[PDB]
Amino acid sequence: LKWNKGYSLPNLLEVTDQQKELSQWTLGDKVKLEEGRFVLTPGKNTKGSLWLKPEYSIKDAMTIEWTFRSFGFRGSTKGGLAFWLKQGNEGDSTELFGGSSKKFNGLMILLRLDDKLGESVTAFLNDGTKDLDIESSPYFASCLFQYQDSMVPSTLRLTYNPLDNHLLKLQMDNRVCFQTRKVKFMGSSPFRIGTSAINDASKESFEILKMKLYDGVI
């Protein structure tokens, strides 16, 4: 029922001591805490990221909820916002959406304007051996989802239960985007949790308002 404070963001508005209350988080590149939320991409052609420092090891099951929005720009762009669960590596690349090398081991959930689906959530797996080629449409799951230019936040909820043969469910605003049993690495290995974004000169503002992790399904 209760969230795991050690793997969650604190209430960002209520923060008084930024250094203390964010000690478990790495702020990457241009991300800034501004008037009660993180702005990942505050300027033209900026990138930013938030990563939990400790690796998470699942007990039975887990829920991650990210509350986010994109404000200020609706239209054509290669910019986007990624949510990551990554395994066993520590390169310095930000080539993929301000967040990762094209070659990574884990799960990337991407909000972007896909050349063929348009405004969408697309989910990708990589096993660390190949460069992910995004423009070949190699995602294992997807849904259409409107995110650009809304003050009203959305919530991504990822639930994952190894005990139910690795059922992973991804909901956007409490509506199912996809469900899968293809993602299994989180049941048996520690992994890193984070988010990243990149924009362009149109200054799309990708923002994180809240993040909670729960040590079960809710």
Residues 75, 148: Cα–Cα separation, whole Å: 8
The binder of K ion chosen from 22, 113, 167, 217 (CB under 5 A): 22
The helix, strand and coil proportions of the chain, stated in percent and rounded to the nearest 5, come to 5, 45, 45
Q: Helix, strand or coil for residue 187?
A: helix
113 binds K ion (CB under 5 A): no
Contact string 118-157 vs K ion (x = CB under 5 A): ----------------------------------------
15 binds K ion (CB under 5 A): no
Contact segment (CB under 5 A) with K ion among 20-28, 30-38, 132-140, 159-167 equals 20-28
Q: How far apart are the first and last CA of the chain?
A: 7
Contact segment (CB under 5 A) with K ion among 14-22, 37-45, 54-62, 122-130 equals 14-22
167 binds K ion (CB under 5 A): no
The least CB distance from residue 134 to K ion, in Å, is: 30
Residues 95, 174: Cα–Cα separation, whole Å: 31
* Side-by-side strand order, sheet with 118-127: 25-29, 47-52, 191-198, 80-87, 105-114, 118-127, 141-144
The least CB distance from residue 22 to K ion, in Å, is: 4
117 binds K ion (CB under 5 A): no
Q: Which is nearer to K ion, 9 or 123 (CB)?
A: 9
- Residue 41 and residue 47 in contact, taking contact as beta carbons nearer than 8 Å: yes
User: What is the size of the binding site for K ion (CB under 5 A)?
Assistant: 2
Q: For binding to K ion (CB under 5 A), which residues are involved?
A: 22, 25
